[PDB]
């Protein structure tokens, strides 16, 4: 009763790298 | 966003030479995603003041990749505040860390990337430190206003420069300005008592030659000088209108060079990291 | 509320008890605040 | 339960309102303002708002 | 260190007041209503009425 949907949130913030580089 | 400036067929003896352009900026006219090389192009050197007037109405973009088919780019500043890119120094001066960069048209000409295949040539503008482009632009506009390693002026658009200068200078004259002018003697006598004050005033200050030639009586009190005060209004006008004087004459700063690991200074003709502002 | 001249009687009876207090709590009887108002009863 | 608000007396000060045309002798207006606000908890302050 | 005292609305005797019910797509709904229909019993009056 303690593990991974905030430890969810926690690991896979992962598949976001662009946050593009362009205006 | 990325600009795609398509290229026609070029000479293999010159396509490769154009591949040596990876950090030079170009001046588009509109920001459509596609464009053509025939569009972004200026003739050979001439009328440096005309050129610098041209570099304010058309936002620039830096190129990043040159493949035999397309040529990518990047709009310099349209929404970006930290968009890190690379651009190479192509000026005569060096550039150290931190200082802002400015773009000024190419001096003396003769720097034209000639493309006999497409029959069109470019003039990639140079990059100078801010405080030095300031001196350059000031010298050019002063010599242009003189007309009632140096290019000859034109007298046609130099009047635009003279007008833009004299307007901002004239609008400095407020009823409080004479109150600040009524202390030139009182200023000079203070200048000669302390070293710093004497160093502040230059040698050809063009006012030190006034403090010993002309006398002015006490200044007449303006209308309703018992409610408001004109000194503060005058000085606020001065600072607000001087904080942008060089901009409406020269070119605004566009980027400041930052370097995380490399050597502090970048010598001429070498790529340098930069962040746009 | 005695000089402004601003159906069904049951509506009147029900309204008493749902009235918004036209007074603040700032240790002085002031104009009602624009923020909110506790419910009071008055005949 | 106990009465929450006081049952005391507090004379209303009309000089806290707006919409009454002033008296045409300014001196008399100021004399009134001086003789009525002197001792009233409801005397206003010369603050702007 | 203290502990919380969790309370559930159902076990409170107050719940008998309201008929709670779940409605997942409540956020999709504009002003809903309900209906009513009532009659009234009638007396068979006489003569002078």
């Amino acid at each position: 009763m303690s593990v991974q949907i905030g430890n969810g949130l926690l690991m896979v913030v992962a598949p976001g790298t662009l946050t593009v580089g362009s205006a | 966003m990325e600009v795609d400036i398509a290229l026609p067929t070029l000479s293999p003896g010159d396509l490769s030479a154009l591949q040596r352009c990876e950090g030079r900026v170009v001046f588009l006219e509109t920001l459509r995603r596609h464009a053509t090389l025939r569009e972004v192009a200026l003739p050979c050197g001439g009328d440096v003041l005309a050129a610098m007037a041209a570099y304010r109405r058309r936002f620039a973009a830096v190129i990043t990749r040159v493949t035999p088919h397309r040529m990518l780019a990047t709009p310099l500043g349209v929404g970006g505040r930290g968009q890190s890119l690379v651009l190479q120094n192509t000026g005569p001066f060096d550039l150290t860390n931190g200082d802002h960069v400015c773009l000024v048209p190419p001096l003396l000409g003769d720097e034209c990337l000639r493309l006999t295949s497409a029959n069109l040539e470019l003039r990639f503008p140079m990059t100078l430190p801010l405080a030095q482009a300031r001196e350059l632009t000031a010298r050019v506009v002063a010599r242009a206003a003189e007309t009632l390693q140096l290019p000859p002026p034109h007298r046609d658009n130099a009047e635009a420069a003279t007008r833009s200068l004299v307007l901002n200078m004239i609008f400095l004259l407020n009823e409080g300005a004479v109150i600040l002018l009524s202390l030139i003697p009182n200023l000079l006598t203070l200048g000669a008592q302390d070293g710093y004050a004497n160093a502040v005033i230059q040698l050809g200050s063009a006012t030190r030659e006034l403090g010993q030639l002309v006398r002015q009586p006490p200044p007449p009190l303006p209308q309703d000088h018992a409610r408001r005060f004109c000194v503060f209004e005058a000085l606020e006008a001065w600072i607000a209108s001087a904080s942008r004087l060089g901009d409406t004459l020269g070119t605004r700063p566009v980027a400041r060079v930052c370097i995380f690991d490399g050597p502090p200074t970048v010598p001429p003709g070498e790529k340098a990291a930069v962040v746009e502002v | 509320k005695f000089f402004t001249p601003a159906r069904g009687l049951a509506r009147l009876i029900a309204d008493t008890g749902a009235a918004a207090s036209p007074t603040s709590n700032g240790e002085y009887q002031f104009k009602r605040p624009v923020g909110a108002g506790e419910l009071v009863e008055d005949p | 339960r106990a009465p929450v608000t006081d049952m005391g007396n507090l004379p209303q000060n009309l000089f806290a309102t707006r919409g009454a045309p002033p008296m045409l002798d300014a001196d008399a207006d100021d004399y009134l303002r001086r003789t009525v606000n002197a001792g009233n908890r409801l005397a206003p302050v010369p603050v702007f708002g | 260190c203290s502990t919380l005292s969790l309370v559930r609305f159902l076990e409170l005797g107050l719940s008998v007041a309201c008929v709670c019910t779940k409605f997942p797509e409540l956020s999709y709904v504009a002003e809903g209503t309900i209906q009513f229909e009532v009659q009234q019993p009638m007396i068979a009056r006489d003569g002078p009425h």
């Binding site: - | 509109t30 304010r56 009823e175 004479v178 030639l213 006398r215 006008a237 | 624009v34 | - | -």
Partner: protein, 327 residues
């Protein structure tokens, strides 16, 4: 994603249930410091407490929707007046609009210009309202439709501007250009003639990064008739004395009267020429102020479609600093 601002306030000027989302909102300065700075800012000859009175005649309330402000100016199409009047729920509203008009006309008269009294926020999207107390929420950076409105009919939004005020520039100036990505500028237009003056609002889009000469030519009549009728009510003296002519012939004179420093109180130095620069009543810069603008962001497209409106297209909020336009 984009980042937002929330500001609880009074339902005085922007009324977020009356309008649907997607319209720019402005932040109004505290009026106390305006009334104060007037005391030192109104020019000579004019009144120096009339803004005090104009404000006192309108009695915190902090925001004001552009949809509301555009109505209380000279330029407006009466359809929008009718909309604001009959479509706002609020009591006493038309009277308030009138008073606000008088306020702004006093502001320009007292040389404390409204552009120094209205910072611009983004376009509102959400609100929760008590009785006459709201909490609007507007974007501040990024593009508008990165947000999420609690309408559930149209989660995203756009940006709506009253088409009566939207003044295009390029197609106006005939640059022969081709519409790509264009900037967006909110501009003010002042006009100064004592007791007969007004304010004009516009929303300008173009590719021009630097307005400057563009407005200087666009508003030529305003600058013309503002530079000459602006110094009025200021007592200028009689014909300027000939001593006012600053002598220039004396700079490179080898033989001329001279005086070294350190002997300037009242010595035998009276032989120096007198020159009295005398400037009392001429046109100062604040006298020739006619317009002010501020950058709003970048835009793809503008289409007109309905009360007339003007839907933006991919607006990216990037607010800049204010700008003077006097020369």
């Amino acid at each position: 994603r984009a980042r937002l601002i929330r500001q609880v306030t009074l339902a005085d000027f922007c009324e977020p249930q009356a309008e649907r989302p997607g319209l720019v909102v402005l932040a109004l300065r505290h009026p106390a410091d305006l009334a104060g700075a007037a005391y030192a800012a109104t020019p000579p000859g004019k009144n120096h407490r009339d803004l005090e009175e104009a404000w006192l005649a309108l009695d915190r309330a902090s925001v004001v929707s552009l949809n509301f402000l555009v109505a209380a100016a000279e330029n407006a199409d009466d359809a929008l007046r009718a909309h604001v009047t009959t479509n706002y729920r609020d009591r006493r509203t038309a009277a308030r609009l009138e008073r606000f008009a008088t306020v702004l006309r006093a502001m320009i008269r007292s040389h404390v210009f409204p552009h120094r009294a209205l910072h611009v926020l983004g376009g509102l999207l959400g609100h929760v309202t008590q009785d006459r107390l709201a909490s609007v929420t507007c974007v501040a950076r990024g593009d508008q439709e990165a947000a999420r409105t609690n309408d559930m009919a149209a989660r995203r939004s756009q940006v709506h501007v009253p088409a009566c005020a939207l003044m295009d520039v390029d197609r106006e100036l005939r640059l022969g250009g081709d519409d790509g990505l264009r900037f967006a500028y909110l501009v003010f237009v002042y006009t100064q003639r004592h007791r007969r003056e007004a304010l004009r609002v516009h929303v300008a889009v173009s590719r021009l990064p630097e307005l400057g000469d563009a407005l200087s030519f666009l508003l030529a009549g305003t600058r013309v008739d503002n530079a000459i009728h602006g110094t009025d009510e200021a007592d200028a003296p009689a014909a300027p004395a000939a001593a006012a002519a600053f002598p220039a012939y004396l700079f490179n004179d080898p033989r001329s009267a001279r005086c070294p420093t350190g002997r300037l109180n009242t010595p035998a130095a009276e032989a120096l020429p007198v020159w009295a620069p005398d400037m009392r009543g001429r046109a100062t810069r604040n006298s020739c102020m006619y317009a002010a603008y501020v950058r709003l962001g970048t835009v793809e497209r503008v289409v007109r479609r309905a009360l007339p409106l003007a839907h933006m297209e991919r607006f990216t909020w990037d607010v800049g600093a204010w700008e003077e336009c006097f020369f």
